[PDB]
Design a protein around this ligand. Structure first.
Ligand code: SAM
Length: 244
């Protein structure tokens, strides 16, 4: 190898770490910019009706990474005996959740929170929650910090109740198009809008949850289609239990 060949490889590491840190430093900005630049923004129901002891028993629920509430307001409208804590670290997204007319404070408490560093106990009482919902959120978090998210959620969960996980899986469509310029690491990619996407394997995700004290209930790939002309989709869909 040349002298410039050797130089270029140490340059690649250096620039790539610069890129990674900038992307991590601005995780919140890029998600906030995402919301400020757009507005065209069932397994869950089954498990809510599952842990109920009575028939119409009230349950309390934490939607971690609520966005503008696409997975929140439906669950509130179908089920009347459910209270949802909701957080997100994008202020603009929070405005949207507080701003649409379905928002009723007898049913829904939304707050800002960076799940990697802000204590959920600041706004969610300890071991108070029956279901936490991590839907397409963990994959936005740096793989090295994902366990922080799971540790944080742990404090909030009533023992014997569970996290409902769903996120991008191995060989999902986006992973199969990113130019290697956008690869940040193994299964870790950056989108054009600066937000990041991790593509989970069943084994890696299971290890994350067990390293932070959960037990595997369900951990399976699920496959779906999107219309263009059909696009194959791979999600990882799981359920992890906080032990009693
Ligand atoms: C693709 S949206 C998913 C929203 C929602 N779970 C749903 O079902 O539609 C990803 C959301 O995760 C949020 N997010 C990413 N990292 C976060 C973090 N560290 N703490 C809190 N929210 C985060 C972003 O603000 C964004 O709104």
């Amino acid at each position: 190898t040349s002298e410039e060949e050797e130089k270029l490889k140490r340059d690649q590491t250096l620039v790539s770490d610069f890129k990674q840190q900038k992307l991590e430093q601005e995780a919140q900005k890029n998600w906030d910019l995402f919301y400020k630049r757009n507005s065209t923004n069932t397994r869950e129901f089954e498990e809510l009706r599952s842990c109920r002891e009575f028939e119409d028993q009230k349950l309390t629920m934490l939607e971690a990474g609520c966005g503008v509430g696409n997975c929140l307001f439906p669950l509130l409208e179908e089920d009347p005996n459910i209270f949802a804590y909701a957080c997100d670290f994008s202020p603009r997204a929070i405005e949207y959740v507080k701003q649409n007319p379905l928002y009723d404070t007898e049913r829904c408490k939304v707050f800002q929170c960076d799940l990697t560093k802000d204590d959920l106990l600041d706004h969610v009482p300890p071991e108070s929650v029956d279901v936490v919902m991590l839907i397409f959120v963990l994959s936005a978090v740096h793989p090295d910090k994902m366990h922080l998210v799971l540790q944080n959620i742990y404090k909030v969960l009533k023992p014997g109740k569970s996290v409902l996980f769903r996120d991008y899986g191995l060989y999902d469509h986006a992973m199969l198009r990113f130019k290697a310029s956008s690869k940040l690491g193994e299964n870790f990619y950056v989108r054009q809008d600066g937000t990041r996407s991790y593509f989970f394997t069943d084994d890696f995700l299971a290890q994350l949850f067990m390293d932070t004290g959960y037990e595997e209930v369900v951990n399976e790939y699920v496959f779906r289609e999107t219309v263009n002309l059909c696009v194959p989709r791979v999600f990882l869909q799981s359920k992890f239990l906080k032990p009693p």
